[PDB]
Design an enzyme around this catalytic site. Structure first.
Site, PDB file in Angstrom:
ATOM      1  CG  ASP A 115      -2.314  -0.561   0.876  1.00  0.00           C
ATOM      2  OD1 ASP A 115      -2.394  -1.543   0.108  1.00  0.00           O
ATOM      3  OD2 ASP A 115      -3.317  -0.021   1.385  1.00  0.00           O
ATOM      4  CD  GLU A 131      -9.944   3.583   2.928  1.00  0.00           C
ATOM      5  OE1 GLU A 131     -10.947   2.848   3.040  1.00  0.00           O
ATOM      6  OE2 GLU A 131      -8.832   3.176   2.517  1.00  0.00           O
ATOM      7  NE  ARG A 164     -11.820   0.148   5.604  1.00  0.00           N
ATOM      8  CZ  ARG A 164     -10.859  -0.347   4.834  1.00  0.00           C
ATOM      9  NH1 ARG A 164     -10.492   0.252   3.712  1.00  0.00           N
ATOM     10  NH2 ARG A 164     -10.249  -1.471   5.198  1.00  0.00           N
ATOM     11  NE  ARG A 216     -12.377  -4.809   0.357  1.00  0.00           N
ATOM     12  CZ  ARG A 216     -11.340  -4.020   0.594  1.00  0.00           C
ATOM     13  NH1 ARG A 216     -10.507  -3.667  -0.374  1.00  0.00           N
ATOM     14  NH2 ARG A 216     -11.133  -3.572   1.829  1.00  0.00           N
ATOM     15  CE1 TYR A 275     -10.431   0.148  -0.072  1.00  0.00           C
ATOM     16  CE2 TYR A 275      -9.486   2.304  -0.494  1.00  0.00           C
ATOM     17  CZ  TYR A 275      -9.526   1.137   0.242  1.00  0.00           C
ATOM     18  OH  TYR A 275      -8.652   0.963   1.297  1.00  0.00           O
TER      19      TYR A 275
END
Ligand SMILES: *[C@@H]1O[C@H](CO)[C@@H](O[C@@H]2O[C@H](CO)[C@@H](O[C@@H]3O[C@H](CO[C@H]4O[C@H](CO[C@H]5O[C@H](CO)[C@@H](O)[C@H](O)[C@@H]5O)[C@@H](O)[C@H](O[C@H]5O[C@H](CO)[C@@H](O)[C@H](O)[C@@H]5O)[C@@H]4O)[C@@H](O)[C@H](O[C@H]4O[C@H](CO)[C@@H](O)[C@H](O)[C@@H]4O[C@H]4O[C@H](CO)[C@@H](O)[C@H](O)[C@@H]4O[C@H]4O[C@H](CO)[C@@H](O)[C@H](O)[C@@H]4O)[C@@H]3O)[C@H](O)[C@H]2NC(C)=O)[C@H](O)[C@H]1NC(C)=O
Ligand SMILES: *[C@@H]1O[C@H](CO)[C@@H](O[C@@H]2O[C@H](CO)[C@@H](O[C@@H]3O[C@H](CO[C@H]4O[C@H](CO[C@H]5O[C@H](CO)[C@@H](O)[C@H](O)[C@@H]5O)[C@@H](O)[C@H](O[C@H]5O[C@H](CO)[C@@H](O)[C@H](O)[C@@H]5O)[C@@H]4O)[C@@H](O)[C@H](O[C@H]4O[C@H](CO)[C@@H](O)[C@H](O)[C@@H]4O[C@H]4O[C@H](CO)[C@@H](O)[C@H](O)[C@@H]4O[C@H]4O[C@H](CO)[C@@H](O)[C@H](O)[C@@H]4O)[C@@H]3O)[C@H](O)[C@H]2NC(C)=O)[C@H](O)[C@H]1NC(C)=O
Ligand SMILES: *[C@@H]1O[C@H](CO)[C@@H](O[C@@H]2O[C@H](CO)[C@@H](O[C@@H]3O[C@H](CO[C@H]4O[C@H](CO[C@H]5O[C@H](CO)[C@@H](O)[C@H](O)[C@@H]5O)[C@@H](O)[C@H](O[C@H]5O[C@H](CO)[C@@H](O)[C@H](O)[C@@H]5O)[C@@H]4O)[C@@H](O)[C@H](O[C@H]4O[C@H](CO)[C@@H](O)[C@H](O)[C@@H]4O[C@H]4O[C@H](CO)[C@@H](O)[C@H](O)[C@@H]4O[C@H]4O[C@H](CO)[C@@H](O)[C@H](O)[C@@H]4O)[C@@H]3O)[C@H](O)[C@H]2NC(C)=O)[C@H](O)[C@H]1NC(C)=O
Ligand SMILES: *[C@@H]1O[C@H](CO)[C@@H](O[C@@H]2O[C@H](CO)[C@@H](O)[C@H](O)[C@H]2NC(C)=O)[C@H](O)[C@H]1NC(C)=O
Ligand SMILES: *[C@@H]1O[C@H](CO)[C@@H](O[C@@H]2O[C@H](CO)[C@@H](O)[C@H](O)[C@H]2NC(C)=O)[C@H](O)[C@H]1NC(C)=O
Ligand SMILES: *[C@@H]1O[C@H](CO)[C@@H](O[C@@H]2O[C@H](CO)[C@@H](O)[C@H](O)[C@H]2NC(C)=O)[C@H](O)[C@H]1NC(C)=O
Ligand SMILES: *[C@@H]1O[C@H](CO)[C@@H](O[C@@H]2O[C@H](CO)[C@@H](O)[C@H](O)[C@H]2NC(C)=O)[C@H](O)[C@H]1NC(C)=O
Ligand SMILES: *[C@@H]1O[C@H](CO)[C@@H](O[C@@H]2O[C@H](CO)[C@@H](O)[C@H](O)[C@H]2NC(C)=O)[C@H](O)[C@H]1NC(C)=O
Ligand SMILES: *[C@@H]1O[C@H](CO)[C@@H](O[C@@H]2O[C@H](CO)[C@@H](O)[C@H](O)[C@H]2NC(C)=O)[C@H](O)[C@H]1NC(C)=O
Ligand SMILES: [Ca+2]
Ligand SMILES: [Ca+2]
Ligand SMILES: [Ca+2]
Ligand SMILES: [Ca+2]
Lengths: 387, 387, 387, 387
Positions: C70, C196, C211, C290, C325
């Site tokens: 990340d 976020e 979130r 997801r 996302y």
């Protein structure tokens, strides 16, 4: 925005300074670059642009095979800002295997010739719209300058030829206003054969130095009166002649009003311009092939057919490296008109057989009134490594 | 549009914040990216641009072999918006193996040097047109700053050098107006050798911090009065010296008016600027090679030759990663002038032999009056995987 | 040009219509495309732009290995016009492994966080110039919204967090004027953990749906008064919760003022907005991973914590394809403010091991008051063929 | 800026001159080029743009497999300046496997259809913002023109169809103002089946020449009154019919008010326009497959159903090379409206099995009042070499 008039004096010139170089072939060994030939440069009131006839393919591409050919349906006129190589984002502004472009102060005019050899079409595109067109008149490869045209007030001139290249042909001067052909004048004077003219504004009119494929190695001149559309023609007097092939500098001769009948049958696009009675010119260094490129001034060379007195020589491309077409463009300044030129640097077939393609890069020099050194700026690609 | 005057105070600076990074080499392992070196940054009134000397080739390209060489006919000045890597759409604005660029508020000026080593040509290009040029005066690699020049009112200054690098040379300051050289001043003062100056506006004049290849590891300073064209020169007093190679921080010494005669014969482009009696500077972390990059403020370092009191150190590139040239640029704000800098991150030959090429990426930091943390932003390319 | 006020009513919304899709991964199998993640969309008064955090590499590139990570020094904020995939000509506007951008009507503001995890730096860049910066305050991954910020009059708000993700952290709301931090407010209310955030103008202020990685699968809400800088917070009441992981629709519960203590410890960026007492929201279709993306309206879901009455469901990404996302952006119209959203479509490691990289493409839908059908618009790349 | 009215007379036309050619497929053998189909051209008041439906992939790309399919979630509308091939920098303006675009003098309108076959969505995007949308009304592939729409004053018309292609369907004409559907008219008249209309301004209204997949090889005509929204329809009278498949020129017949019941069941997009009682039209040269393309004028062909008297024939694509869809666009001049057309040049599956993909390039001709020669401008890619 206003029409250009070029009504300023030519700038004082002691020679030429480096201005731009695109390294097109070197990049094409590691990138997607158009195959091109017959390039030229032209500037709107703000920026300069580089043009070339694409071959409808990139270099690292199976379709670059046999691109030595001059006329295909796939050739288009490429247009980029000067210094931006011809990448896949390049705009193809028209269909063309022969072309000319110029900016009149308000918009671009492109003259684009495509189609069959014995029945070609010239398309006149102004401000992004097709305004006019004309068919071949002699049915034998209608063709034009492969360098910039010139617009004064609102009227652009362009020289076109149709007929036998190595013999008698029909050359006409077209007067174009906002893309519309408003008048057509026949070539008149003592220049018999005229092709691939390098024109430049010489207020109140237009002057061109051309290529004679027929009976001479001294370059034809064409003077264009942009008001009454009258044409006078002659030859560059300079005993140092500007074409290729040509005789060596001892044996060469010239005339102001006649071809010199030396090394007729061939030739190359090139340029020259007047500075009082002197002529500034470029030419290949080698007398028989397109190797090297050199620029110099011939003292009294614009009027004295016996003058062989050169000075201010500069080597642009050293004698061992390939050159090609070259031509003039003009840049308007604060108080004077400068003269610049480009040199096509041809690589590939037929002279170099390591590859199957034929393409070019370019180098561009601009007139200067300052000082300068020496150098050599060839294409620089290693064709043996491009396999 | 109006000429820049830079007539605002320098902004308060507690250090530097990250601003831009291009990742040029990492991209070039999977894309068509120019081979470059000697990059720099400069901003017009609206945007910032990144420049570099191209090598006339992309990285993944047979022509990138042996690009450690500094001067070829194929090197051109590349110009992109800051943050846009040098891809095939990049404009080559001129021919150059040494250059400088700046914007006076109305248009760009580019100083571009190319040609033979013993007879090079500087071309002065303003607003896209060649305005002037000058030949090498000492016949020994005419060369200039490799970072932005500075224009105040309508007058741009640029420092050029010609002659023996590791000895006595001739350095001149040129004053250029709309591309025309209007005055030429000889380097005067106690700075003997001056090269690759990093200049910045310090109203009413221009200040430069330079590289001494001859007798010193403390950087020369050159102050330029832009009105009467007078020149004073000296050295950065700071006992923490800014060049590479240099002695360790215990053994190093400096003088305000003389080279320190420590690690002479070599050097690297770099920068520093004054904040009252303090100096803000960057330098490589390693004393002998171009590894790491660090920035700090030396308390009283602008006036005290014995001061070794640093504070606000930031690591820009950690000690184990390669750096290179660095330089300053200035950005005009609402009410003050900020100072920023770039760091060249060199990869390839000769120090790294896994590849045959030599190129760089860059990282850019800008002065801040806020707060900041720590980090390290190296080139990050894996040369062992680029085969 | 004038500052934005967003002082118009929200447009009537019956659902969402397709708006843009970039096919980034499919292209990257035959072209040079950036590796990215955490994308978002934001519009200036004229055009819309797509942003993402690059990984300092293209996809077909040895440096794309291990891009599941990340935070690296090589991550930059990429900015293109919406619909233009991230090619080599993309501008890297700043250094960042966490970012937010918005346009106040006159210029862009970018908030860019980079550096060490325990000591990161936020850079505030306005109109292309660095104006301010702040250091991490809790020394634990200073991070921000990964979607657009909101500017009203001249004042932009952005929510930043620093501290333990799966626990107690310090969240602050910054008020920024022309890039300068003019005020800082601490998160206040009953939303304990907030990250976020997906913010949108709700005149006279700003509303965000966030979130919660800590104690809940119902999304936190943060209301920002842009004048007195006061903060109220709560949770989306809807019994159909918007986070992932979450319980199935029978077992899930929610509260207006407290986390639901269901599937705490994880979460995903997402969005929702109010339409009277109703809430429009999107979420992944699969409750635990997801996969899929669906949008619907919950009747009374903005105020009734027991309401499970959805209607106007649309499948954006079918249940078998990967999402990621998602976030909101707002578009000012002739007489009302529309609401749109983007969905990140993540492909690669760790969930898909056929490749070594991790990247995403995007799909974008805009609110509509007309009618619409059904469909599914997944990423569509075949990772088994990308070897 | 002002709305377009097209309130000028049609320009005098003796035929058509070459205007643009993109060589898209030839380039794609050595570059990253979009796979496309169903292209068209449209011009804002300044420049012309080329559009096409992308397939969400480049050509040299594993995802180009099986791109003969017409509707996928990955198809987007590509938009470039005319002459710029579809490279990776091309903007995808919307999601679409069927589309239409036009410029009203102030901004672009795009009509973009995507989603499920039995439940598709048309998105109306004006000036870069989604303004409206409508669901499929017959639940059977809502589809539109695949060429430019026409705007007069502020009102744009677009023809959409939904239902059985080879039978009875529901065709509607939508009136759109700044992206908002302000009126919807049902197709009325004797044209039973109407699809893929090629529309052009014919002040005070709009005229379209369409494709009949049902009962005829003579093309339907649709006249649109843009004020009262009334619709009249018929067929191109010309005994030389414009569709493919069709009977040979001896056996073919036509009617002004009825399909000719010859070679029903299939068809191709095409165009025609009126010049007094004459019709200018193009069509494929081969009667049964999409090989060749020819243009000509039929004397009295706009009113005489028995007229087979053609003149001014031009070959655009010779009979042995592949063509495809073609369509009309209009260009406003100084004092008249010109008519131009594009021809899709389809290569790949299913007819050519050397490759797995299906794509096209284009060629564009514009009406002229000058003279012209002959030629042939095919796609020119060698599919046998693209392996
Ligand atoms: C750094 O870069 C700079 C910038 O590029 C370089 O400076 C440039 O250098 C070039 C190369 O030399 C120069 O071009 C050459 O110019 C000369 C002409 O200039 C010379 O001669 C002039 C006339 O002199 C005569 O008359 C005067 C009275 O009027 C009298 O005093 C004198 O004794 C003599 O009788 C002089 O005016 C002139 O002096 C001026 O300039 C000097 C600088 O050069 C300076 O020192 C002075 O103060 C003064 O200002 C100068 O002496 C051309 O002759 C020459 O062209 C010949 O040479 C090139 C190769 O260079 C060759 O390719 C050409 O074909 C040509 O050679 C033919 O002609 C020669 C003479 O006839 C003969 O010797 C050759 O064998 C050959 O003959 C063949 O061709 C002829 C027809 O052409 C044919 O009839 C024969 O049968 C046979 O086939 C170049 O054009 C630039 O002018 C100069 N530029 C500047 C701005 O200074 C500099 O060199 C570089 N520095 C370094 C260190 O690299
Ligand atoms: C072409 O495209 C268009 C546009 O996309 C498509 O049209 C869209 O279709 C979708 C899919 O159906 C619709 O979304 C669903 O909406 C319903 C709610 O609407 C229905 O119910 C309303 C309430 O009815 C009740 O009250 C009224 C009185 O108020 C009473 O009359 C009635 O009998 C009943 O008691 C009605 O108002 C509404 O009618 C209106 O709309 C109709 C069109 O749909 C139209 O015919 C009418 O004229 C009128 O205008 C309508 O009947 C939601 O129920 C549904 O969400 C459920 O289903 C989805 C799958 O679709 C699922 O993922 C959800 O989780 C959810 O399923 C749960 O709930 C169900 C009901 O509780 C239950 O049956 C399920 O088993 C499941 O239960 C689970 O979850 C709950 C919590 O959620 C939990 O408690 C349980 O324990 C369990 O775990 C969707 O949101 C769109 O509205 C519609 N859009 C438009 C604009 O029309 C069209 O389909 C496409 N056409 C083709 C050919 O493809
Ligand atoms: C360089 O480029 C330029 C520009 O591209 C080229 O010039 C173009 O050349 C093309 C090709 O020839 C021309 O198009 C053709 O036009 C003719 C019609 O024009 C001719 O006939 C006219 C009518 O003549 C009749 O009436 C007059 C009185 O009104 C009477 O005097 C005369 O004797 C006769 O009875 C004439 O007006 C016209 O003359 C004019 O133009 C001349 C230039 O062409 C010029 O010389 C004159 O001064 C005058 O200005 C002219 O003679 C069409 O017939 C023709 O279409 C047929 O041919 C094409 C192939 O070209 C074919 O594909 C078509 O299908 C069609 O062929 C059918 O019809 C023929 C006649 O019925 C028949 O012979 C065929 O067998 C065939 O029949 C089949 O189809 C019919 C239905 O169509 C069916 O009933 C049958 O059963 C059967 O199935 C072309 O359209 C361009 O007009 C011309 N353009 C210009 C601007 O000049 C030039 O060629 C190039 N130069 C070089 C060196 O390459
Ligand atoms: C093009 O023109 C040249 C004239 O230069 C023609 O070549 C001449 O042809 C005659 C007859 O065959 C020869 O006697 C001459 O010697 C040739 N002249 C030269 C200079 O070589 C040529 O035939 C013409 N081409 C065409 C197609 O007419
Ligand atoms: C460039 O200048 C340096 C002076 O720094 C010259 O090197 C000196 O040469 C002399 C004579 O050979 C030696 O005694 C000195 O020790 C050298 N100085 C240093 C500092 O090393 C060098 O020769 C010059 N180059 C040219 C081409 O003149
Ligand atoms: C500065 O960099 C040099 C390399 O340029 C380092 O010198 C190396 O040190 C290692 C370990 O001592 C030796 O094995 C190598 O032989 C050295 N390399 C060379 C090229 O000489 C040096 O350690 C660095 N200095 C500091 C303070 O980090
Ligand atoms: C981040 O915060 C969480 C609180 O949610 C901490 O995890 C708790 O740790 C304690 C002590 O080990 C356990 O008894 C709890 O069960 C944990 N809570 C949950 C919800 O799992 C975590 O340790 C914190 N991290 C740091 C670095 O302080
Ligand atoms: C689409 O319409 C056509 C009408 O053209 C339908 O095809 C007809 O079907 C009937 C019944 O099977 C046949 O008797 C006719 O001969 C067909 N007509 C033609 C011209 O071939 C077709 O079935 C329709 N499709 C759907 C799905 O309803
Ligand atoms: C029109 O095109 C078709 C092909 O689409 C041509 O038909 C081919 O003709 C050759 C030679 O007669 C046959 O060997 C092939 O079998 C045919 N191909 C197919 C696919 O049927 C036809 O000749 C063309 N017509 C004209 C008038 O040129
Ligand atoms: Ca000749
Ligand atoms: Ca030194
Ligand atoms: Ca959660
Ligand atoms: Ca048909």
């Amino acid at each position: 925005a206003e029409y250009r008039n070029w009504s300023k004096p030519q700038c004082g010139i002691t020679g030429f300074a480096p201005f731009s170089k695109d390294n097109s072939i070197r990049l094409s060994a590691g990138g997607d670059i158009w195959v091109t030939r017959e390039p030229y440069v032209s500037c709107d009131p703000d920026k300069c642009y580089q043009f070339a006839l694409g071959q409808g393919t990139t270099l690292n591409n199976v379709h670059s095979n046999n691109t030595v050919r001059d006329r295909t349906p796939y050739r288009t006129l490429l247009m980029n800002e000067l210094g931006v190589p011809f990448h896949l984002g390049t705009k193809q502004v028209c269909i063309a295997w022969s072309s000319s472009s110029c900016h009149d102060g308000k918009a671009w005019l492109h003259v684009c010739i495509t189609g069959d050899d014995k029945n070609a079409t010239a398309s006149f595109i102004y401000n992004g719209r097709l305004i006019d067109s004309v068919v071949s008149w002699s049915k034998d490869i209608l063709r034009t300058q492969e360098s910039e045209c010139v617009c004064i007030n609102g009227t652009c001139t362009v020289v076109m030829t149709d007929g036998n290249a190595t013999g008698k042909a029909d050359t006409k001067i077209l007067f174009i206003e906002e893309g519309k052909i408003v008048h057509t004048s026949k070539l008149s004077g003592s220049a018999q054969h005229v092709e691939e003219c390098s024109c430049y504004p010489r207020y109140p009119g237009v002057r061109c130095v051309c290529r004679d494929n027929w009976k001479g190695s001294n370059r034809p001149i064409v003077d264009i009166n942009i008001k009454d559309h009258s044409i006078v023609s002659s030859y560059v007097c300079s005993g140092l002649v500007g074409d290729t092939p040509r005789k060596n500098d001892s044996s060469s001769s010239s005339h102001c009003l006649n071809p010199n009948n030396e090394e007729g049958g061939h030739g190359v696009k090139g340029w020259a311009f007047d500075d009082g009675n002197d002529v500034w010119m470029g030419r290949t260094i080698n007398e028989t092939s397109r190797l090297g490129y050199e620029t110099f001034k011939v003292v009294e060379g614009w009027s004295n057919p016996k003058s062989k007195l050169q000075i201010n020589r500069q080597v642009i491309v050293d004698r061992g490296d390939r050159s090609g077409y070259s031509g003039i463009f003009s840049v308007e300044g604060k108080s004077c008109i400068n003269r610049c030129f480009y040199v096509e640097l041809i690589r590939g077939r037929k002279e170099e057989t390591e590859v199957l393609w034929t393409s070019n890069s370019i180098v561009v020099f601009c007139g200067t009134s300052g000082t300068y050194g020496t150098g050599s700026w060839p294409d620089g690609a290693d064709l043996n490594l491009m396999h």
